[PDB]
Ligand binder design. Structure first.
Ligand SMILES: [Cl-]
Ligand SMILES: [Cl-]
Lengths: 300, 300
């Protein structure tokens, strides 16, 4: 029988789909890895389960442990879902500016929210989690930007899925960088197995930090953290492509209307970059895999 | 290589998961079929592609064809997505009372909406589609309640998935009835293959039409159409269970908080029924498969 014991056993193993229309000028094949197929509709389901699994396996979860993370994006959703499946108490800090829709989603999974001053933004949320954890030893903080289980799950799952599903023919992987876990884990496995493979990191033109520029505000949720992420192995990244806000939005729109792929704005951004790489004559005939991190319905 | 040519090739093949906590009093095994794993998060993706496939295969789609359907639920989403992938123009009628969120979702896939008088509700939407189709021969109307491709896709996909994933050990299938396609197609295949198998239809206590009662208003979106659906084969249905609004909601809540399964209210209703059947001593040791039609995030 093929029956999962719980929802966390159904995370990952996401499909590839060939882009047919959003391919203007391409001389390479572009195929998209659809992370919206995860149970809570994003890539972060992988790291939500992986980080808790690593803690469990290291004996860090105690009978009175409470999971705690500062989060304004998909990792909060992923942790809330996984904690519901696990039977863990889950506390998430975030600015009081977070939408009522997002709060209802997290609360639907039974997570408890601590809202921090709007003016202090995400620094205030992080500060609150830091203080909570320092003063109450029940809290276990996954730390998505520093946890080695983040790139590790991408080595074990995402990378192998890309490898197997392309029968090792993948030539170039294009991925937005938030924590850097996805592109790092995939590159760690695939570049060592196929040294000719290349890896393109995608960031916002509005906050081109990996490119050597300065942090700034931008709407491409999921990428452009404003610092070099500790988990990112920059030596595995062969190129950085910056993407403008309007281009990201426009291509995200095109994916929905022309491919039936309703994806987030960071998926638009990743696809802008993949299409740029795909137009290069030296890439004629190559296979480009672009990661599409989440579903677009939350962004409407 | 395992690469889909387009998103419609990634419809169905949804997983089974064992219920662990929402099992109070059960002496049978309850496993849930997670239709939220479809690309647009509901079971209707199956019939959206199947109905257009059947039209294509029957030469009914012409160069100037426009897809037209009256819809206030998931079939509109499914058709909008599939039409985007196909490159078809898609027009959907619905009452002007439909939420801005739902309209934005359908428009994100490029569908065009015709809003009908709020006071006339869904009868007004159906009337508008009827009139449009009568006066403009470009329109092709799928007719989800009457189209034989609805139960047929469930015979070819859903039923075989249940059969294979349970290694033929499925004893009882529990499913909400909207169009009746899901329970009909599954029963057609499985009852003939395994005559001992039984099939339980689920409807709202507030609108217990299959049970012999009268139509009434109810909030269990997706089931309780207020009439006997033409596609439903009542002779394959072994039992009908009515479910109250509060019980459906309560169990839907429990699935999210206790299993990490964020599902719609009709999934709550189906699970209420499955748990009732599972408590019967004569069902000790049996395998019950309950269909969970969609994701809960839209209902928040
Ligand atoms: Cl986050
Ligand atoms: Cl509908």
């Amino acid at each position: 029988m093929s029956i999962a014991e719980d929802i966390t056993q159904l995370i990952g193993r996401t499909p590839l789909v060939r882009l047919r229309r959003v391919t203007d000028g391409a001389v390479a094949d572009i195929v998209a890895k659809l992370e919206f197929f995860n149970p809570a509709n994003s890539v972060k389901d992988r790291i939500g389960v992986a980080m808790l699994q690593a803690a469990e396996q290291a004996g860090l979860i105690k009978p009175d442990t409470i999971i705690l993370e500062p989060t304004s994006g998909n990792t909060g959703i992923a942790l809330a879902m996984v904690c519901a499946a696990r039977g863990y108490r889950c506390v998430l800090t975030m600015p009081e500016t977070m939408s009522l829709e997002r709060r209802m989603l997290l609360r639907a999974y039974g997570a408890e929210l601590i809202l921090t001053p709007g003016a202090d933004g995400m620094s205030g949320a992080i500060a609150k989690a830091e203080e909570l954890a320092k003063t109450d030893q029940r809290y276990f903080v996954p730390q998505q930007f520093e946890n080695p289980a983040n790139p590790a799950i991408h080595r074990v799952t995402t990378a192998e899925e890309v490898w197997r599903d392309t029968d090792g023919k993948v030539d170039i992987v294009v991925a937005g960088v938030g924590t850097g876990g996805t592109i790092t884990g995939v590159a760690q496995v695939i570049k060592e197995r196929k040294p000719s493979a290349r890896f393109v990191a995608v960031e916002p033109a509005a906050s081109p930090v990996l490119s050597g520029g300065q942090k700034g505000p931008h709407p491409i949720q999921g990428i452009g953290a404003g610092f070099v992420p500790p988990v990112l192995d920059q030596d595995l990244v062969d190129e950085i492509i910056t993407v403008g806000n309007e281009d990201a939005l426009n291509v995200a729109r095109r994916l929905a209307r022309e491919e039936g792929l309703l994806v987030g704005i960071s998926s638009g951004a990743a696809t802008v970059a993949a299409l740029q790489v795909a137009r290069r004559p030296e890439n004629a005939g190559k296979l480009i895999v672009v990661v599409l991190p989440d579903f677009g319905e939350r962004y409407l």
